[PDB]
Design a protein around this ligand. Structure first.
Ligand code: HEM
Length: 467
């Protein structure tokens, strides 16, 4: 792995980053092709490039792109990369969109608030551990029934929307033992959230609209924050009134209730809901396309495990007896990371290596990793583009080191020192719970795919119940 200069060019200072983003958003093949073509052009998995949003929302679009399993890990090393205000890349949404505060996700570990706020969330998680499984069953059973009816009535049932409502209803129940639907919020939370998220991420979001529409009004200037305050406040009122026990733990940690509510709202709506809104449909899709053989093997493992080690109910002890289910969730997180982009700013001069070279990174340079390419490295995973259910079973566990959906090796856990997802254990558990409730109720099912900015819109067409 001989030392080499990083290939790639940032081009003319204002012209290039705009041209590059047009390619990124409208070029044939999408952002995937954007990265694959440069890879081919430079015969390298590491190269220089501009990234959106460009020219007005961002004052520095320059980055070093990482696409292989060997160089990517640098993004985890907080001793070498700073993780300040780069949660969303080369720009940061306005803090007016977050109560005037810089919430946890944007804080570098060297910031006192990072440890405080993260500990606050660890509290919120731990403090709900006994509601997770019970509330999940209740919430998702509701969802499934609803889907069965809709299906029985129209032959087809869209999953996304109603799944989002379930996700949010589930979170209020688990996190705060509250049903958001039994409040002013009704079933509109998924809509209020998406709306608020649009304002934050518009600069880098592809809504599938014509460039002559997206460029002038989504990709050049930040959207006026005052327009979304009405919406934001509705969410704020909910959390402020139902997160009392967490808000108090905050003050004990040294954080005012105000700043607590804003951070809580963010973690639940942005971090959690945002990730689940994507993770679940994707998991449902991969499973659905796996075939009947897998459906039977899963239904079989899960039911037997529940009955033999759960005594009729779902319990941690039982989940531990479902090796295929565990692998199935891990494969879904590997093949299609819910949140693909991770950034890191070099705190000093150091070197990194890809599979065939070494590169010098100079202090201040922005490192960027497109996870989907990194976790599909053929030199790590055989048949990387295929969904292999038992990939992580038995000896497969030796690879968990490479599943990076949480912005860290799956084998590691979030700490106040690192920037790994604070709810890592929670999402893996609730995802396993999703698969579980799915195969207790059904033996098999079929789906059809649509198109959207979430990747794939899933629609259920058949539901063979257990009975
Ligand atoms: C499947 C759903 C989820 C996915 C895919 C996901 C993904 C991620 C990723 C990729 C990061 C790293 C961002 C970066 O610095 O570049 C992150 C950070 C974080 N996530 Fe999640 N997350 C999920 C659910 C949750 C949940 C449910 C919580 C709630 C407690 C949570 C809390 C956090 C926090 C607090 C951070 C920042 C931690 C820090 O500042 O060190 N996440 N998440």
């Amino acid at each position: 792995k001989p030392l080499r200069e990083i290939p790639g060019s940032y081009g003319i200072p204002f012209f290039q980053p705009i041209k590059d983003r047009l390619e990124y958003f409208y070029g044939t093949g999408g952002r995937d092709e954007y990265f694959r073509s440069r890879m081919q052009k430079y015969q390298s998995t590491v190269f220089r490039a501009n990234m959106p949003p460009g020219p007005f929302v961002s004052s520095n679009p320059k980055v070093i792109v990482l696409l292989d399993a060997k160089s990517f890990p640098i993004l985890f090393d907080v001793s070498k990369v700073e993780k300040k205000d780069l949660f969303t890349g080369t720009y940061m949404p306005s803090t007016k969109l977050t109560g005037g505060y810089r919430v946890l996700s944007y804080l570098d570990p060297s910031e006192p608030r990072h440890a405080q706020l993260k500990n606050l969330l660890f509290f919120m998680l731990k403090n709900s551990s006994n509601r997770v499984i019970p509330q999940f069953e209740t919430t998702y059973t509701e969802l499934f029934e609803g889907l069965e009816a809709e299906l029985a009535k129209n032959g087809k049932a869209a999953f996304n929307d109603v799944g989002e409502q379930a996700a949010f209803r589930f979170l209020g129940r688990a996190y705060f033992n509250s049903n958001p639907e039994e409040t002013k919020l009704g079933t509109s939370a998924p809509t209020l959230i998406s709306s608020w998220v649009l304002f934050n991420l518009a600069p880098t979001l592809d809504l599938g609209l014509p460039w002559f529409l997206q460029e002038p009004l989504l990709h050049t200037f930040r959207l006026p924050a005052f327009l979304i305050k009405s919406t934001y406040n509705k969410l704020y009122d909910y959390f402020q009134s139902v997160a009392t026990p967490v808000m108090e733990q905050a003050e004990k940690l040294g954080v005012p209730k105000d700043e607590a509510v804003h951070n809580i709202l963010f973690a639940v709506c942005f971090n959690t809901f945002g990730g689940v809104k994507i993770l679940f449909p994707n998991t449902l899709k991969w499973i659905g396309l796996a075939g009947e053989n897998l459906h039977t093997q899963l239904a079989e493992e899960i039911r037997g495990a529940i009955k033999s080690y759960g005594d009729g109910n779902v319990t941690l002890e039982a989940i531990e007896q479902m090796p295929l289910t565990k692998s199935v969730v891990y494969e879904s997180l590997r093949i299609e990371p819910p949140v693909p982009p991770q950034y890191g700013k070099a705190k000093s001069n150091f070197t990194i290596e890809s599979h065939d070279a070494t590169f010098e990174v100079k202090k201040g340079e922005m490192l960027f990793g497109y996870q989907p390419f990194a976790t599909k490295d053929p030199k790590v995973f055989d048949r990387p583009e295929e969904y292999v259910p038992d990939r992580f079973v038995g000896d497969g566990e030796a690879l968990l080191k490479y599943v990076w959906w949480s912005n860290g090796p799956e084998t590691e856990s979030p700490t106040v020192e690192n920037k790994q997802c604070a709810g890592k254990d929670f999402v893996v558990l609730i995802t396993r719970l999703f698969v579980i409730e799915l195969f207790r109720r059904y033996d098999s099912f079929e789906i059809e795919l649509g198109e959207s900015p979430l990747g794939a819109a899933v629609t259920l067409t058949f539901l063979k119940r257990a009975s």
